[PDB]
Amino acid sequence: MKVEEILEKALELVIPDEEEVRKGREAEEELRRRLDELGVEYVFVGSYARNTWLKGSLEIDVFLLFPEEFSKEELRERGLEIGKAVLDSYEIRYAEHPYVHGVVKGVEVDVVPCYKLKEPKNIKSAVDRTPFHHKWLEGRIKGKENEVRLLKGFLKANGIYGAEYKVRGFSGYLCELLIVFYGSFLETVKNARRWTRRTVIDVAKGEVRKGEEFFVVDPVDEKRNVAANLSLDNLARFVHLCREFMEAPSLGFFKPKHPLEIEPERLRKIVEERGTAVFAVKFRKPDIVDDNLYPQLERASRKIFEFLERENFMPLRSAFKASEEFCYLLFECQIKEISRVFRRMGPQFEDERNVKKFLSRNRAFRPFIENGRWWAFEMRKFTTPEEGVRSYASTHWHTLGKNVGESIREYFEIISGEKLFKEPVTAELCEMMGVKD
Amino acid sequence: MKVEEILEKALELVIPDEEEVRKGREAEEELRRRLDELGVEYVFVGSYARNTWLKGSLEIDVFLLFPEEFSKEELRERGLEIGKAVLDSYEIRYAEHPYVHGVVKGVEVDVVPCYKLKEPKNIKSAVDRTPFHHKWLEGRIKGKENEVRLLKGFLKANGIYGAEYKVRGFSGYLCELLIVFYGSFLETVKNARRWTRRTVIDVAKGEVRKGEEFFVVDPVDEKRNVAANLSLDNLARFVHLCREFMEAPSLGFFKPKHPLEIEPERLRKIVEERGTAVFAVKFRKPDIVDDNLYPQLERASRKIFEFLERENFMPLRSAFKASEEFCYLLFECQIKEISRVFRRMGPQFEDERNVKKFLSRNRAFRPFIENGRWWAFEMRKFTTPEEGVRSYASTHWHTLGKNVGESIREYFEIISGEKLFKEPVTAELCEMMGVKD
Ligand SMILES: Nc1ncnc2c1ncn2[C@@H]1O[C@H](COP(=O)(O)OP(=O)(O)OP(=O)(O)O)[C@@H](O)[C@H]1O
Ligand SMILES: Nc1ncnc2c1ncn2[C@@H]1O[C@H](COP(=O)(O)OP(=O)(O)OP(=O)(O)O)[C@@H](O)[C@H]1O
Ligand SMILES: Nc1ncnc2c1ncn2[C@@H]1O[C@H](COP(=O)(O)OP(=O)(O)OP(=O)(O)O)[C@@H](O)[C@H]1O
Ligand SMILES: Nc1ncnc2c1ncn2[C@@H]1O[C@H](COP(=O)(O)OP(=O)(O)OP(=O)(O)O)[C@@H](O)[C@H]1O
Ligand SMILES: [Cl-]
Ligand SMILES: [Cl-]
Ligand SMILES: [Mg+2]
Ligand SMILES: [Mg+2]
Ligand SMILES: [Mg+2]
Ligand SMILES: [Mg+2]
Ligand SMILES: [Mn+2]
Ligand SMILES: [Mn+2]
Ligand SMILES: [Mn+2]
Ligand SMILES: [Mn+2]
Ligand code: NA
Ligand code: NA
Numbered sequence: 001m002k003v004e005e006i007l008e009k010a011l012e013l014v015i016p017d018e019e020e021v022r023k024g025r026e027a028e029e030e031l032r033r034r035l036d037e038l039g040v041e042y043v044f045v046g047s048y049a050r051n052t053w054l055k056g057s058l059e060i061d062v063f064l065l066f067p068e069e070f071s072k073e074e075l076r077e078r079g080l081e082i083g084k085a086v087l088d089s090y091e092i093r094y095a096e097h098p099y100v101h102g103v104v105k106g107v108e109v110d111v112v113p114c115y116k117l118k119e120p121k122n123i124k125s126a127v128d129r130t131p132f133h134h135k136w137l138e139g140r141i142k143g144k145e146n147e148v149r150l151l152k153g154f155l156k157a158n159g160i161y162g163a164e165y166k167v168r169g170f171s172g173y174l175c176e177l178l179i180v181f182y183g184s185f186l187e188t189v190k191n192a193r194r195w196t197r198r199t200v201i202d203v204a205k206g207e208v209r210k211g212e213e214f215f216v217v218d219p220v221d222e223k224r225n226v227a228a229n230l231s232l233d234n235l236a237r238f239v240h241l242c243r244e245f246m247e248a249p250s251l252g253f254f255k256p257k258h259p260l261e262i263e264p265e266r267l268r269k270i271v272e273e274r275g276t277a278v279f280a281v282k283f284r285k286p287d288i289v290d291d292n293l294y295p296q297l298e299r300a301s302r303k304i305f306e307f308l309e310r311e312n313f314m315p316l317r318s319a320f321k322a323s324e325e326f327c328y329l330l331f332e333c334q335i336k337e338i339s340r341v342f343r344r345m346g347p348q349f350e351d352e353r354n355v356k357k358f359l360s361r362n363r364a365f366r367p368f369i370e371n372g373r374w375w376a377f378e379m380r381k382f383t384t385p386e387e388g389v390r391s392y393a394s395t396h397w398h399t400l401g402k403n404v405g406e407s408i409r410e411y412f413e414i415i416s417g418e419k420l421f422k423e424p425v426t427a428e429l430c431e432m433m434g435v436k437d
Numbered sequence: 438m439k440v441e442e443i444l445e446k447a448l449e450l451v452i453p454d455e456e457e458v459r460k461g462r463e464a465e466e467e468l469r470r471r472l473d474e475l476g477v478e479y480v481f482v483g484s485y486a487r488n489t490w491l492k493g494s495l496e497i498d499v500f501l502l503f504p505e506e507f508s509k510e511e512l513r514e515r516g517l518e519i520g521k522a523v524l525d526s527y528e529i530r531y532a533e534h535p536y537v538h539g540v541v542k543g544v545e546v547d548v549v550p551c552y553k554l555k556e557p558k559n560i561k562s563a564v565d566r567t568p569f570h571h572k573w574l575e576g577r578i579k580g581k582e583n584e585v586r587l588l589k590g591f592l593k594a595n596g597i598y599g600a601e602y603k604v605r606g607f608s609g610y611l612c613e614l615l616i617v618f619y620g621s622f623l624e625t626v627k628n629a630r631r632w633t634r635r636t637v638i639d640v641a642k643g644e645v646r647k648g649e650e651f652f653v654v655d656p657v658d659e660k661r662n663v664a665a666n667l668s669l670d671n672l673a674r675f676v677h678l679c680r681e682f683m684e685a686p687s688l689g690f691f692k693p694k695h696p697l698e699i700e701p702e703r704l705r706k707i708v709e710e711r712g713t714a715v716f717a718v719k720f721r722k723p724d725i726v727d728d729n730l731y732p733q734l735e736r737a738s739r740k741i742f743e744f745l746e747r748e749n750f751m752p753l754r755s756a757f758k759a760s761e762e763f764c765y766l767l768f769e770c771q772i773k774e775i776s777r778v779f780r781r782m783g784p785q786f787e788d789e790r791n792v793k794k795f796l797s798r799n800r801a802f803r804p805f806i807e808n809g810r811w812w813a814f815e816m817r818k819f820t821t822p823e824e825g826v827r828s829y830a831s832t833h834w835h836t837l838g839k840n841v842g843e844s845i846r847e848y849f850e851i852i853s854g855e856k857l858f859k860e861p862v863t864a865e866l867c868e869m870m871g872v873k874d
Contacts (some may be wrong), residue, residue: 193789196787197786197787197809232808232809233806233807233808233809236786236806236809237806239786239787240786240792240806243789273777273801274776274777274778274814275774275775275776275777275778275820276776276778312751312771314749314775316776316778316779316780316814317805317807333776334749334775334776334778334779335772335775335776336774336776337712337773337774338712338751338771338772339711339712339713339753339770339771339772339773340710340711340712341711341712341713341753341771342753342771343753349634349673349676349677350633350634350676352630352680355677364710364873365870365871365872365873366871366872366873367871368754368871369670369673369674369677370670370754371669371670372634372669372670372673377711377753377870377871383712433802433814434802434803434804434805434814435802435803436801436802436803
């Protein structure tokens with residue numbers, strides 16, 4: 001409908017609505033009042049402070065700013081003192097080191113203790129950069145606020161907004177850096193069509209160059225890759241989305257896909273036509289945070305995938321899902337059944353001692369020589385990938401993540417067929433198999 | 438029963454019987470008469486001449502010896518003149534270049550034209566060494582004649598006597614060299630326990646050393662590996678037989694195994710228990726000599742084996758058989774059925790042009806990105822190894838040997854199950870699967 005018109009139409013999917021902006025204003029002012037009354041020195045940072053926050057993602061970030069001469073725990077203990085005092089309700093969250101998260105007049109707030117540093121060149125971790133992030137952006141982003149929200153909204157609609165591990169996409173800081181660097185959403189999208197996995201965007205130098213990996217240089221700290229948590233595949237997906245958008249722009253790119261919602265019968269028929277084995281490992285979800293859980297699910301699912309490959313079941317793809325009480329590791333394999341008999345490798349013919357040992361063992365079939373080396377027919381203890389994974393998960397739970405593996409130790413189930421389709425996994429299955437509408 | 442006693446008992450399985458020795462004497466004398474009457478200059482060479490020939494393998498080798506100054510075809514045309522004159526019946530065989538084979542008083546004879554060379558250092562091919570082979574052995578082998586027959590008999594009972602391609606075992610000349618080098622059958626057997634695939638036996642130097650491959654240096658020509666046609670696997674099998682013999686000597690090692698002669702029902706059950714796909718390619722045997730046929734069958738069977746591996750049917754082993762009118766290429770595979778769906782590799786995400794092409798094609802399922810690269814689900818045109826090989830043999834017969842492939846072009850059949858067990862292949866199947874007694 002013309003790019004420029006679509007972008008105007010997208011601004012309403014993306015700009016927070018009426019009651020939301022004033023909900024923030026009312027929380028912010030009340031928070032100021034409570035802080036001011038305590039004589040606390042602070043700064044509101046992040047996307048609230050710069051009016052760059054996406055529709056529906058209202059959260060206030062406050063950094064408490066304490067004089068340089070308070071020790072490491074003097075900032076930690078005194079910092080947590082104020083968060084409790086100033087929030088209606090609160091939890092003690094753990095990013096890299098302890099901070100406070102809580103609520104004020106219905107609005108999410110994070111309070112973080114950090115040093116009040118005159119100029120950077122003084123950085124222990126992420127926390128101490130953050131005031132400088134805001135400082136750097138404040139007023140380079142003025143005027144371009146809706147460009148940021150357009151980019152956030154594009155990425156969110158497409159499942160790649162956020163650097164948390166469940167997503168491995170783009171952070172807010174990265175989105176604002178990009179807008180500063182290219183000037184607009186549209187220009188970011190046009191130029192990202194030519195990004196590669198070796199693209200280095202150096203914001204402070206106004207430069208793009210090649211490096212070893214995708215790297216967005218923090219203007220506040222040259223060693224920091226702002227895009228560190230962006231996965232290779234989400235970068236790929238973004239580059240492709242940018243190419244598709246420019247070739248045929250649409251409002252559709254700013255609206256989340258309403259999921260496939262398929263009936264078990266249609267999935268049964270798809271699985272039939274593909275001729276694969278589709279199954280899942282079901283187990284209880286351990287009570288750990290997403291940033292801990294999802295890396296473990298990834299590892300568990302990889303280790304099982306690798307086991308399936310090794311055992312010649314020819315896995316096609318895998319996926320995983322956490323509901324509220326259970327986790328599922330989903331697999332599709334090209335081999336439903338393998339022969340009972342296999343070939344075991346023995347020694348070179350020259351090696352008399354080891355040959356004697358190899359031939360000592362009783363077997364149903366006679367070993368043989370092939371290309372200078374002994375081989376034996378021996379018998380598998382499983383012939384389906386489901387039986388293999390029951391064995392593997394029973395015996396090798398210790399490699400499947402600390403908490404995921406411990407859970408699988410207490411209880412797991414392999415589910416196939418119509419029973420699999422009763423579990424809340426049908427969407428993940430459809431995506432794994434590339435099912436169309 | 439004591440080695441020394443077993444060896445005495447083996448001498449009767451190995452020394453030609455009464456009517457055979459005199460059958461040879463009568464043929465030899467008659468052959469001399471016919472040659473002498475023509476004024477031909479000749480020498481009886483080979484195992485008849487040295488009384489080293491195995492029981493049942495009576496054949497007379499004559500070399501016609503012509504003065505140095507006759508051109509290449511002067512020896513070829515004049516040489517074939519005498520073979521026709523002197524044999525009762527004859528064929529014109531083709532070794533490296535044309536010679537005569539025929540019969541005299543019931544006995545096989547080969548007549549070969551060669552130069553009468555005073556001292557070697559004058560060699561164009563194999564033919565011109567041969568008089569020198571006999572010369573070298575004549576009287577180094579005197580006294581050790583039965584040692585040779587013991588070794589030939591050992592190898593024959595175990596299917597590895599003869600350098601023709603059907604066998605890829607030990608030639609007669611190689612057996613006599615070995616006996617000269619070690620002094621006896623028993624010592625040959627004791628020392629061969631330590632042969633490796635890098636063992637070089639240098640007969641004329643009285644030396645054993647390491648080289649790049651198993652090499653037995655012709656005492657008559659240092660460049661010639663007398664063991665050139667011995668396969669790696671037959672060398673392995675011989676080394677192992679030598680170790681087994683010395684550990685528990687028996688007359689059994691000089692008697693051919695009477696074959697397994699199994700009933701189809703037992704084979705059906707074995708195949709069931711292994712859980713494999715067992716099948717054969719059947720086609721008409723081309724009318725070519727064994728030394729041409731067997732290398733082609735080997736190549737055909739390898740190419741099909743390699744196709745099966747490539748297509749993920751996980752072949753275990755293969756074998757082949759020629760009867761009088763048909764050939765069979767036998768296969769056993771671990772996968773009886775593979776899924777219809779597979780993964781096709783596409784381009785890296787960066788490569789816009791090629792990605793557009795990859796995604797242009799209509800497919801039932803959506804392509805996806807994994808590890809920086811596009812992939813598509815696509816559909817196999819076959820899901821069993823039998824269907825695969827029907828396709829492969831129909832389309833790629835041109836790589837399956839000149840004559841074997843041409844035959845398969847005119848007609849082939851894939852046979853599985855109870856029908857397979859009707860063909861004269863049950864022995865080869867039993868051996869391929871390592872079936873016991
Ligand atoms: N571990 C952490 N603890 C405290 N602050 C962090 C931490 N990690 C990053 N930060 C900084 O805090 C600031 C706000 O972070 P946040 O992820 O909330 O970004 P945002 O710009 O406010 O975007 P969003 O709209 O998604 O909330 C950023 O400058 C960021 O660098
Ligand atoms: N490279 C491979 N080749 C052949 N077998 C392998 C290979 N890697 C692993 N295995 C076999 O698979 C088993 C399990 O491997 P895996 O890494 O999934 O589990 P693990 O618990 O991490 O390993 P482990 O039990 O050896 O400590 C190993 O114990 C080994 O016998
Ligand atoms: N292509 C050939 N044409 C003619 N002579 C050959 C050819 N190849 C090898 N020879 C030689 O002819 C001689 C006899 O060969 P042959 O294979 O018959 O051996 P043998 O000692 O007589 O054993 P056997 O008892 O198995 O017949 C050997 O010295 C051998 O080197
Ligand atoms: N290395 C491999 N990796 C993937 N595909 C292969 C490979 N080798 C062969 N192929 C595929 O298998 C087909 C047949 O291979 P094969 O060598 O058995 O028959 P060919 O008649 O000798 O080959 P061609 O038809 O290519 O001349 C090839 O045409 C090719 O598409
Ligand atoms: Cl960052
Ligand atoms: Cl030779
Ligand atoms: Mg926040
Ligand atoms: Mg928060
Ligand atoms: Mg002969
Ligand atoms: Mg002959
Ligand atoms: Mn924020
Ligand atoms: Mn383990
Ligand atoms: Mn001979
Ligand atoms: Mn071909
Ligand atoms: Na197990
Ligand atoms: Na074909």
